[PDB]
């Protein structure tokens, strides 16, 4: 899922580099909110057919992560695994192998 500690420029550039379709979603570190992160998904308006959206996330008080109150987890891997089946609160589900 995540490639490392990239998500603003690096991610937005690699997300549109090879032409990886929807589902290529990665996790990174927030530059404005440490301890939390922002989902970098290749989501568009369907007119451009090429764009990246940043979903600002918040860390759980009990020590976890959740994009929505309808699906909260404790680890990133567990979160990814659940969104890898379907969309629990995003524009698209996390269905992608790798793109290194």
């Amino acid at each position: 899922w995540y490639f490392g500690k990239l998500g603003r420029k690096d991610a937005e550039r690699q997300l549109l580099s090879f032409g990886n379709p929807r589902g290529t979603f990665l996790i990174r570190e927030s530059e404005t909110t440490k301890g939390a992160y922002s989902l970098s998904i290749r989501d568009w308006d369907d007119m451009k057919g090429d764009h990246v959206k940043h979903y600002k996330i918040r860390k759980l008080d009990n020590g976890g992560y959740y994009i929505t109150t309808r699906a909260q987890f404790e680890t990133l891997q567990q979160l990814v695994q659940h969104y890898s089946e379907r969309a629990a609160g995003l524009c698209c589900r996390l269905v992608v192998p790798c793109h290194k």
């Binding site: 404005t32 959206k53 940043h54 979903y55 600002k56 994009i67 929505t68 609160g89 995003l90 524009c91």
Partner: peptide, 10 residues
């Protein structure tokens, strides 16, 4: 302000 745009499916 950062470009934060959360899109849920509620």
């Amino acid at each position: 302000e950062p470009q934060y745009q959360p899109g849920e499916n509620l």
